[PDB]
Amino acid sequence: SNVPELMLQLLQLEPDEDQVRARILGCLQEPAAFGLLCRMADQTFISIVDWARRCMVFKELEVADQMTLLQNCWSELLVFDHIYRQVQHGKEGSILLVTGQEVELTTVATQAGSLLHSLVLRAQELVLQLLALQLDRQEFVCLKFIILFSLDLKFLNNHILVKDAQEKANAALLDYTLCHYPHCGDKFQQLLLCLVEVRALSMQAKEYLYHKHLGNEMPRNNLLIEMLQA
């Protein structure tokens, strides 16, 4: 059936998962597990950026605006990435990591601390929710874009260019949504809700890292910590 342009293009702008696992997995080789995961996160964050750099209207923007956009949505993109991977993982007993690993919820239930434990379960509630709505790649992809440009226009230099990117994305989703998912429920508005949820997790996730930081647990050259401070 008829798919919006923005969704088609954006779908070509997506990298190979195996390539990601390849890229992320190889970059690792150079407590113990903790440090690895921090590095794995940082790496998925960089990969999340090359996605941005190679992005459409985002690249045509000034560097001053690119910085600020990412500085505002880096956390949501990450969490959302972790989230969608579970939409494809399907399971409810364990979480799937960008590497390829599997971690049972029983394992984090006993090992993780109050906060992470908490956050991880909250993230999974959002995974069931998005599964019910039947989230697909076309929307998934469209949604990431939307998260990238979800900022107040009073914070950018290139005013108009962004306002066009935002309205473009929302109308694209509404189209694809009312069109292909003609079942009952307003998926366009419903999905938008899942996104404000993501934004809530993002903040909690930032509070965790910050906790780790204060406690001097995070790696030294950690990228995430570099974003947390701004």
């Binding site: 750099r53 910085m67 990412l70 500085q71 570099e226 974003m227």
Partner: peptide, 11 residues
Amino acid sequence: AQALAALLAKA
């Protein structure tokens, strides 16, 4: 930023 300014489009 560093990892963003220097790392974004510098390479």
